[PDB]
């Protein structure tokens, strides 16, 4: 009962750890894993040791039991260091959410608990060749063959999909094309080692080069029936409800990117002399920095509201789509403006902002592109007006 | 103590009151008062009587002793009804602020007390014909003369002048030009009845026609020395302080208007059809709307954060300027979009959206133009990195 | 053969006549006409005298016989004075176009010829209270009844409506709803003094208040078939076809207003100072004028290009819509920035910039809303790639 | 004489030749060169062979004797393939520009003549690590010693730096700091293979990774008197001079990549369907294309105007500065939209769009940043309002 913008001693302690870790382990090696292309294996390890991975796993399963808000503050900090490794570890939680919300004790313990004992990854396999933003356009089919299920399809752009222990897998179990999404799709927690799982090579993408990404072909995969999340019929509802406590964490990573961009940009403008004065003394630049600051400022509050909304038992879907779009956009503007303020050196590879720009782009694409996000916001908006 | 984006019960009541009143009373007459431009007397009265006026006066002087956050919820609702009115009511709290923050109980009891017993209006006189934004250079003379001061200057655009019982005045004392703003001025209370004062005519502006914005000159106005606010010099430090508390409320004032524009566009979008499809069914109108809502939700948070910050004790200068600038910038955006949504009708006077566009402009102008706001934002921001 | 951004001596002098008139006779009275909302008859006939009216009438009907390029040119000048009066003039060319392109020697000499010898006004009746952007959705009836057509419907927002000698009118001639618009409507020439025509009440809008806009109720208005265009059914073609020769001049209208803004804004920037340095010295304001300058130079060429295109006998459509889309949008952006430059003053009625803010708006709404301008351009652009 | 947007049959040839080359030869090899970051030697000689490099060298030196308007013409088509390869080409015209406009006969035949018979390269040395935008701030010295000038200092970001056969070198001659720039710098023609020239490592930047941009240091580079452009003092003059011819050409570059990005995004929108329909059918995507199309056309008219002015014997600094300013900005908006329309695939290195977004940024940095472009435009525009 009363608005508050002050964290908790527990929450502050977190942001303190994450900060220290990012600024002191990730940043100093942020460039290498970007150049080299390789997976940030050890940093994944360190985060695990520092408890900054798999925050949401229910306490009973030994998981820390931290809410969406905590995930968002911790994530933003890591993102400040590198969105590559940040996204890498956020891959897990993304793929775990479906289980965490649709799982029964058995499913949850036998799968979450493993990550509890050892630093193992997991991926969210759903997006594929002709259906990305259009979730209900998946062709991967799941045919139940009595005892257990048979999977035959292909996925694409799966984060940490080549380093995952198990994958969340969506599929269509209703053959009739006109079979509605609420009853045509079915999900299956599916271990990796399952034969018939051929995984592609590391895709060369223009950013978040240390992040692991590739495709997967699931031809004649025998999925053990007990793994089917809620049961044949409810797959779509699961996946959709999962990221409601995910997108806010996504935005958190983007605003973390905006922040770094702003931090490197302001520092440079403070010492670069042009036309007898520090860049900051040039009103154009001053304005550039101010607006940049209010964008990062507004983006933080945009996710903090969505995290809190779900954390207080509500469907943050509306605000979730707000934070996601705003952060996703301003992330992109601040990066470029930062590269802009740095000048030639900004375009230079021996400088930070170069990477910051190429990375930010992805925030307007995965987990709801700018377009579809605005489609959801209006959907909810308009619905609060009709009868 | 953790974040909370949930009001306090008491607040919900005010909210409903400010609302009920605005939607059931201000609205039906907002256009008559726009057409005729006549001061909204019956409305302000009913506001004071309904208790949505002079909220910041402490319980001591027999006032509601309300904080800025509370004030903002109230103003943001009354604004949705008609900012022309909302401003007339606000000008009171704005002109009383300097006293409320820097006045001795003798002054407070006297001047703030009367405000409570009889519905009155006060004014904030600072801006002069050739001196606005640059407050540190308003040239109105105030000369020491025993137990009083003589004032010879000129103001322009006083909100509520011409209908004010008493004025808050910023005047230059130290005649020496090398005198830092700091000590250069001296602000005090001036009763309107004091001979020497000339009230100019109501300036006709584009929007917020019913507010009383007019000229005024002080031709050898005698202010008894007790009426001063702190001392010779303190002036610049007084009026300047009114902003920490007034600024957020102006943002709330913009947000209210934004909400009005939005509501109007959306209602129409759900009825008007073009090419066998409701306007809302066109992916372009839906996009416009998602961005309209995205703007307000964010803007709202921007001001609340500010109001809270100052109320929790810490300086909200950085946050206040963010809300003023942003809200002021989007309120105009939304306004023009609302007109566009209502097409031809939009440009017509027998529709709300058109009026909104005219009113909105002032939010990007008074209480520091958006340009100067960013000067502050960049100021507070860059200073952090230089500590 | 190659590119040339040079004018001809003839053009050069049209422009000069245009300017003198706009800057000497229109400009002074402009504001007075805006306040009253009165129809500017004096100027209308003065233009008619000076030949800055009805320049598309072929030299055989006693007209100037000028193309679209020379028209836009003249238009920008008048617009600069006031778009309210300019629209009142250009509105004639709109009602004339369908006759100029599709009329026949007998019709043209009768309905264009009377414009030559007298300062007569004429309108363009198409839009209906429930149809505007969706031309094909109009319901004004017109059915063969002997040797004349019987018209029964209502038109809305007709510029020059209550001041027109005759009107161009689009009516649904085929009762069968599945009648393809491309062969479903019929355009006629309807003398206003024809019984059954009830010219509606003068409407009141935000801007362009002196333009005599109002709806018409065609009550069993009987028009001879001799006034039909090239046939029953071809009316839609005439409507859509006239646009190609009218959109460029409407874009010039916007650019004219845009130049007035950049002038009042820049001129103030030179005599107004704040914080010691003139406004035009403050880097942000310099950047405002810079952005304002760019927006106009391009919009000018946009409409110029489009005019030339059609003048060279090509398909126009793709360039003209780009013009109207851009010119319409930037105009609003300049008129608004102009007000902001003059701060408190620019918002006041005693100032020229404020009026422009109201005017600018219709350049996004009327004669092809910005949204459909984009739709049109999208249709053309993509067609270059589809097979 | 009247306006014209028609090409001379001769220009239609240079275009068709350039389009043929750049699309059938640059485009394929392109991707590789960016990944490998290797100089496009093979492609360079090919252009030289087609006679569309050095277009500006006068006919008396065996050059083509082409104007700015014809260089841009060809340049865009060359850029459409790869601005990396094209920038490397423009490096020559740039190093050559100062000598084409300010070198005597013996100089023009000594240095231009060679580029005519052997496909050599040249470079432009002005920028210093401590100063680019602030040209008057370069610290390189020019000690007059007998029949030579001793160059001492460093240059940075020199395109063709290590591959160059000779460079144009601006430098400070008069040691007095209070020397007004316009008569304090001296431009030289320094032969690459001189004793005190030490190049340096190829700078790996985010974009245009096949054109070699390097730093370089001069340690007592005796330059003979014979190779000064106009004379001591006349360096700043001749330097500023060049920018007028070159500006439209760099704008041409940007506008080039813009259409590349616009074509790619459109070709994709016609093959990718989502939610039962190609992207071109969703208003959102379509609206992007329209606005993308508009900008490209206006940018085209941006540089074409700027090129025509200069070639007509007019001071194009005004239009040339809006051309580079605008074309640079929309090139960067397009590159990021193209990627967006191609979604996840757009972010994949295996697709062209991501490669455009990278090379695109440099257009808002080099040859004068968007900021100084606004300054010059604001500065060029204000002169028209004082006298
Ligand atoms: C590094 C990386 C990591 C990713 N990680 C994952 C992951 O871990 N798991 C996973 O399952 N997926 C992941 N993805 C995939 C990503 O989530 C999808 O590509 C995203 O959904 C966008 O869809 P698309 O490109 O297939 O959709 P497309 O529809 O092909 O999107 C392309 C464009 O079309 C527009 N568009 C489409 N439909 C509409 C419409 N109806 N209205 C308006 N505009 C429309 C889109 O907004 C976008 O601008 C990742 C991608 C990358 C590159
Ligand atoms: C209806 C209305 C009510 C008002 N009520 C009050 C009131 O109660 N009390 C009061 O004291 N005043 C009041 N004002 C005046 C208002 O406070 C001033 O309008 C505003 O603070 C500054 O405007 P000006 O006209 O003085 O602007 P100016 O002093 O002319 O300067 C503003 C213009 O220049 C720009 N600018 C100025 N300096 C800089 C700079 N250094 N850098 C960049 N840009 C700069 C601004 O962005 C804008 O373009 C009111 C105005 C209106 C229209
Ligand atoms: C002062 C004035 C004078 C006029 N004079 C004339 C005149 O002389 N003669 C005449 O015949 N008409 C005239 N008009 C009418 C004018 O052309 C219409 O106002 C215009 O066509 C659109 O307004 P509407 O109300 O019909 O738009 P609506 O049909 O109400 O459209 C409303 C909104 O929805 C958007 N929209 C519509 N369809 C789509 C879609 N498919 N996809 C996406 N967005 C869409 C529109 O862009 C607009 O924003 C005038 C209008 C005004 C304001
Ligand atoms: C790939 C590449 C190729 C190049 N090729 C060449 C070449 O062949 N030859 C050559 O001689 N140089 C070349 N350069 C250098 C390039 O022209 C400069 O880097 C560019 O002018 C920016 O100057 P800077 O990097 O020193 O910017 P800085 O001046 O260090 O700072 C620039 C930043 O601050 C802003 N800023 C600066 N002054 C002001 C002001 N007064 N008001 C407002 N904002 C301001 C700028 O707009 C930008 O945002 C090249 C650079 C690159 C990266």
Coordinates of C-alpha atoms and ligand atoms in Angstrom, one line a residue, chain A residues 268-269 272-275 277 279 281-286 288 337-348, chain C residues 283 287, chain D residues 87 90-91 94-95 122-134 155-161 168 203 205-208 211-214 243 324 362 364-373 375, ligand 4:
Chain A
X268 CA 34.2 9.7 -23.7
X269 CA 32.2 13.0 -24.1
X272 CA 37.2 14.4 -25.8
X273 CA 38.1 18.0 -26.8
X274 CA 36.7 19.4 -30.1
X275 CA 36.6 23.1 -31.1
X277 CA 36.0 22.4 -25.5
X279 CA 32.3 17.4 -26.1
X281 CA 30.1 21.5 -23.7
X282 CA 28.6 21.2 -27.2
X283 CA 24.8 21.5 -26.6
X284 CA 24.0 18.9 -29.4
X285 CA 25.9 16.3 -27.5
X286 CA 24.5 17.4 -24.1
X288 CA 22.1 13.6 -27.0
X337 CA 24.3 7.2 -30.6
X338 CA 27.2 6.0 -28.5
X339 CA 29.1 4.9 -31.6
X340 CA 28.1 8.3 -33.0
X341 CA 29.5 10.2 -30.0
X342 CA 32.8 8.2 -30.0
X343 CA 33.3 9.1 -33.6
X344 CA 35.9 7.3 -35.8
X345 CA 37.1 5.4 -32.7
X346 CA 33.5 4.3 -32.3
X347 CA 33.7 2.5 -35.7
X348 CA 37.0 1.1 -34.6
Chain C
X283 CA 23.5 25.0 -30.6
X287 CA 20.1 22.4 -34.9
Chain D
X87 CA 34.8 3.7 -50.6
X90 CA 36.3 7.2 -53.8
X91 CA 39.6 7.3 -51.9
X94 CA 39.3 12.5 -52.8
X95 CA 43.0 12.5 -52.8
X122 CA 45.9 7.9 -53.8
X123 CA 44.8 9.0 -50.3
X124 CA 43.5 11.9 -48.2
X125 CA 45.5 12.8 -45.1
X126 CA 43.8 15.4 -42.9
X127 CA 42.4 13.7 -39.8
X128 CA 44.6 13.4 -36.7
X129 CA 44.0 11.2 -33.7
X130 CA 43.3 14.3 -31.8
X131 CA 41.2 16.1 -34.4
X132 CA 39.0 15.2 -37.3
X133 CA 35.8 17.3 -37.3
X134 CA 37.8 20.2 -36.0
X155 CA 47.3 11.3 -39.6
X156 CA 44.6 8.8 -38.7
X157 CA 41.8 6.9 -40.5
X158 CA 43.4 7.4 -43.9
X159 CA 41.5 5.3 -46.5
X160 CA 44.0 3.7 -48.9
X161 CA 46.6 4.8 -46.4
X168 CA 47.3 15.0 -50.2
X203 CA 42.5 -0.8 -38.7
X205 CA 36.5 -1.6 -38.0
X206 CA 33.0 -2.7 -37.8
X207 CA 32.1 -1.8 -41.3
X208 CA 33.7 -1.5 -44.7
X211 CA 38.9 -0.9 -47.8
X212 CA 42.2 -0.3 -46.0
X213 CA 42.0 2.5 -43.5
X214 CA 45.3 3.1 -41.6
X243 CA 34.5 19.2 -49.9
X324 CA 25.4 14.2 -46.8
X362 CA 30.5 5.2 -41.3
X364 CA 27.4 9.5 -40.2
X365 CA 31.0 9.9 -39.2
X366 CA 33.7 10.5 -41.8
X367 CA 33.9 13.3 -44.3
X368 CA 32.2 15.4 -41.7
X369 CA 29.7 14.1 -39.1
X370 CA 25.9 14.6 -39.2
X371 CA 26.5 17.1 -36.4
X372 CA 28.8 19.4 -38.3
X373 CA 26.6 18.9 -41.3
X375 CA 26.0 23.2 -38.1
Ligands
LIG4 C1 36.5 4.3 -41.9 C2 37.0 5.7 -41.9 C3 37.5 6.3 -43.0 C4 38.0 7.6 -43.0 N1 38.7 8.0 -44.1 C5 39.3 9.2 -43.9 C6 40.2 9.6 -45.0 O1 40.4 9.1 -46.0 N2 40.9 10.8 -44.7 C7 40.9 11.6 -43.6 O2 41.7 12.5 -43.6 N3 40.1 11.2 -42.6 C8 39.3 10.0 -42.7 N4 38.5 9.6 -41.6 C9 38.3 10.3 -40.4 C10 36.9 10.9 -40.2 O3 36.7 11.8 -41.2 C11 36.8 11.5 -38.8 O4 36.9 10.5 -37.8 C12 35.4 12.1 -38.5 O5 35.4 13.5 -39.0 C13 35.0 12.3 -37.1 O6 36.0 13.1 -36.4 P1 36.6 12.4 -35.1 O7 36.4 10.9 -35.3 O8 37.9 12.9 -34.8 O9 35.3 12.9 -34.2 P2 35.5 13.9 -32.9 O10 35.6 15.2 -33.4 O11 36.6 13.3 -32.1 O12 34.1 13.9 -32.1 C14 33.0 13.7 -33.0 C15 31.7 13.4 -32.3 O13 31.2 14.5 -31.5 C16 30.4 15.3 -32.3 N5 30.9 16.7 -32.4 C17 32.2 17.2 -32.7 N6 32.3 18.5 -32.7 C18 31.0 19.0 -32.4 C19 30.5 20.2 -32.3 N7 31.2 21.3 -32.5 N8 29.1 20.3 -32.0 C20 28.4 19.2 -31.9 N9 28.8 18.0 -31.9 C21 30.2 17.9 -32.2 C22 30.6 14.7 -33.7 O14 29.5 14.9 -34.5 C23 30.6 13.2 -33.4 O15 29.4 12.8 -32.7 C24 37.9 8.3 -41.7 C25 37.3 7.7 -40.6 C26 36.9 6.4 -40.7 C27 36.3 5.9 -39.3

